[PDB]
Ligand binder design. Structure first.
Ligand SMILES: [Zn+2]
Ligand SMILES: [Zn+2]
Lengths: 365, 266, 365
């Protein structure tokens, strides 16, 4: 049963999903459930069901598959040839679950502030909620030498629905009381090149992606607004006018604009799509050109294993190498979630005034 | 030449194509604040004004083989707070530059440009309130590779469709990236050249075409794509089998068993 | 190399361009540059490149032409058979350049008024800027017996861009200070049949077009608001409420509506497209039916020189005579720039109160 390679746009799709941790993987051990890691046997690439042993299309989403279809498999695609994608996908999956636990944590606390405490901060300012960063996803590959990316994915039912719900609830509260969070950024790119660091946070080394070439285990980074409180001319009134998120992002419930967090986990800021865009989706702030590199090893692997015409007729002009190049030039468009280029142009307060340090996430007035 | 047969035209809306599907399109990335006004003359020396900015798309002429383009802005609006398409002019501009289109941001990178054709638009009121409807157009351009005479291998050939005007077009008035949100009809100007997914090939391997196109890819292929041709040759076989075969659902026949044989061994 | 006649819509296009002075003409002497008059060898008619010796299509805008293509030319189209178009085009060209110099002149002056002078007029009214009409394009075919239409076209780079820019600047100023110009009309048709004339202006004879059958040399006509100033009940307050352009046309920066001038040159008012239409284009106030007559002689010329079927198949039903007739009935639509039918319906002040006379253009309060 002869099989063909997938088309360019289907590999672009694989990559886009990987960086949302939603690639549909099938292993003979665990089936279509990727909660427990196992070597991929098949992966869904833009509708097509691809064999991870030859990278041939052996099915589609239309007909259900319980096993890897019997096919004439060249068997020359090695695990090492596509693990970069598998890594990207699994790590993002671990990352989203980690980010969720963090959001819930802030939510619950914020949703417990006594009406008195709230009102006091509304009037004079000062701390309202503080989370010990040591408690932010303590046993993830991002916070412990013992954990690995191959570890089981924390089973979370309705991950995306909760992420949407909680992030919304949290931000609506932060907005109605003109509060100030120390875990948000107007432009996440400032995290890698802009904000000034203090404490241990100074040695931070941003890979700016999710790959197995730079430790992803690190601390929870947030803003140190301490010196702001101290400042006389920057009291409550000041905060209400420039610091509260609404001033730079717009009022949460009335904006399309995305909001980003500071590097809370995996030295990777999170971007949340605006509320009026439909729902609040979360995406890691990784460049498209970076995402594409996860298939760099696969290109050579395919070129070595498949026939010239087969590669040309499936991947298009320039074969798969050509596809890779043409895609690299389009990365900003074809490999970039819309939310990443949806930040408010106008920014009063900004991200460059106070320093970022490994510390406790918190909401204050 | 041997594989090809008389081709048929194809329709596209360059604006709604996916650039990761139609390998013959290039685009200036949005969100970069890219925006620059330029000036180009037509073959009669007349100077024209138009803007290139984030979102602007062009057709990569190189490698598509002889091809005729006809653009129909009929039905579209393009009406903005400070821009009325009625009486305005649109044109086809052909660029010749060594710099890749995606990288453009300043007028200095466009190399050699010529407005090759233009028409004046007529707008009225459409069934949709507050919207203006542009009259049917037939802006044409024939891409003849031999006329361009590409020499320098680093030369890129681009095709654009935007508003052109005798007066500088104020960027905040007319904000559209181009007028590619229209009906484009491509017609091969040769039946001896064949392409595969956007680019010319000197020869085809029919059997490797089998099962290698996604619906997206087929739809985005050029009118002279080998697949399209394979399909028209194959349909004569389908027609033949039907003249002889009166088999009902699930009934075998002399024309179905050949597959059964392959399946049996497979 | 057999050639065919152009299609109806292409001749309509030629005419429309002629009355904007933008017909692309080619002469063996000057090439595609028409700065210096010469007999036309080719003209561009709606995309097609037509031979002016047989009126056959010998090319298009797609392929560049350096000479008149070698073709089987019947050579029966005489210069006299299409000069009416050439005349129209060249005269409009001369007209636009003349109108531009006038606009610039008002602009510069208005853009020099000392803040004191301005403010005084803002408060009490009275003259603010005055141009000696003898200085308005003194050496044009419109102001001197010595000049001719065949004279060289004043080389002006970016004519249309300047016309747009200056007209805008000038009107924005006139609008912000509620000023009053004496060179504008709410409905240019009133110039030919409405406004009452005084002085020598009474003998004015409007051809209502640009043709070689009525002198186009005349004075600069404007409104004589003199008796308005004198009137007690029509002081500054009155002007701010009814006379300033904004009251009848709308606020310049917020309107689609066109603004017209009084007969400044060639006894032909100029119409400027509204600012919110995209740009400010200038067009002479000539009826479509008038424009069409420029090809009346060409029709007979073609009917005499071409074969019956050739004319029928190119010009359509009724041949070229039929085309001419059908077009005459459509003139209001197919030969009328949109700006000419875009004036405010509501007009408080109007054009009929004060008289028009050959005088100095001016802006006052
Ligand atoms: Zn396989
Ligand atoms: Zn001729």
């Amino acid at each position: 049963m002869e099989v063909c390679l997938p088309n360019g746009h289907q590999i672009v799709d694989l990559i886009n999903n990987a960086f949302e941790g939603r690639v549909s993987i099938y292993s003979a051990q665990e089936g279509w459930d990727k909660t427990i890691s196992a070597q991929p046997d098949m992966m869904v690439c833009g509708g097509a069901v691809v064999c991870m042993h030859c990278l041939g299309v052996v099915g589609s989403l239309q007909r259900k598959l319980k096993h890897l279809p019997h096919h004439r498999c060249n068997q020359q695609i090695r695990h090492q040839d596509y693990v970069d994608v598998q890594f990207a996908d699994r790590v993002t999956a671990h990352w989203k679950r980690g980010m969720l636990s963090f959001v819930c944590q802030m939510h619950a606390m914020m949703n417990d502030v006594s009406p008195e405490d709230l009102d006091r901060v509304r009037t004079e300012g000062g701390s309202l909620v503080e989370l010990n960063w040591l408690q932010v996803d303590p046993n993830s590959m991002f916070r412990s030498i013992h954990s690995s990316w191959t570890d089981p994915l924390q089973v979370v039912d309705d991950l995306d629905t909760k992420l949407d719900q909680y992030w919304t609830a949290l931000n609506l509260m932060i907005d109605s009381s003109d509060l100030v969070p120390n875990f948000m950024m107007r432009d996440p790119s400032h995290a890698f090149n802009g904000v000034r660091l203090e404490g241990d946070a100074r040695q931070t080394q941003f890979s700016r992606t999710f790959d197995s070439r730079s430790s992803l285990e690190w601390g929870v980074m947030v803003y140190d607004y301490s010196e702001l409180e101290h400042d006389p001319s920057k009291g409550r009134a000041y905060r209400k006018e420039l610091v509260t998120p609404a001033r730079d992002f717009g009022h949460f419930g009335l904006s399309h604009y995305s909001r980003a967090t500071t590097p809370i986990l995996g030295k990777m800021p999170a971007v949340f799509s605006g509320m009026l865009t439909g729902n609040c989706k979360m995406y890691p702030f990784i460049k498209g050109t970076a995402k594409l590199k996860t298939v760099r090893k696969l290109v050579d692997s395919v070129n070595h294993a498949w026939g010239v015409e087969k590669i040309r007729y499936a991947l298009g002009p320039g074969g798969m190498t050509g596809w890779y190049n043409r895609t690299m030039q389009q990365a900003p468009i074809v490999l970039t979630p819309a939310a990443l280029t949806m930040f408010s142009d106008t920014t009063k307060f900004g991200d460059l005034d106070y320093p970022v340090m490994i510390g406790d996430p918190m909401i204050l007035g | 030449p041997v594989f090809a047969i008389p081709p048929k035209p194809a329709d596209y809306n360059v604006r709604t194509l996916k650039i990761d599907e139609a390998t013959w399109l290039r685009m200036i990335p949005k969100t970069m604040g890219t925006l620059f006004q330029i000036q180009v003359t037509d073959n009669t020396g007349t100077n024209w004004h138009f803007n290139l900015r984030g979102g602007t798309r062009v057709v990569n002429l190189d490698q598509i083989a002889p091809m005729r383009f006809v653009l129909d802005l009929g039905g579209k609006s393009y009406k903005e707070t400070s821009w009325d398409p009625n009486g305005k002019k649109v044109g086809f501009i052909v660029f010749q530059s060594k710099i890749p289109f995606e990288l453009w941001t300043a007028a200095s990178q466009i190399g050699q440009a010529t407005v090759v054709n233009y028409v004046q638009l007529y707008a009225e009121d459409s069934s949709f309130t507050a919207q203006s409807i542009i009259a049917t157009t037939s802006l044409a351009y024939n891409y003849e590779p031999e006329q361009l005479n590409k020499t320098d291998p680093e030369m890129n050939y681009y095709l654009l469709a935007t508003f052109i005007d005798s007066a500088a077009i104020t960027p905040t008035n007319m904000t559209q990236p181009d007028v590619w949100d229209a009906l484009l009809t491509m017609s091969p100007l040769s039946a001896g050249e064949v392409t595969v997914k956007g680019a010319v090939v000197s020869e085809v391997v029919p059997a490797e075409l089998i099962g290698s196109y996604t619906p997206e890819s087929l739809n985005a292929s050029l009118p002279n794509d080998a697949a399209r041709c394979m399909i028209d040759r194959a349909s004569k076989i389908a027609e033949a089998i039907k003249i002889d075969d009166d088999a009902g659902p699930d009934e075998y026949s002399p024309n179905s068993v050949p597959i059964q044989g392959q399946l049996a061994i497979s």
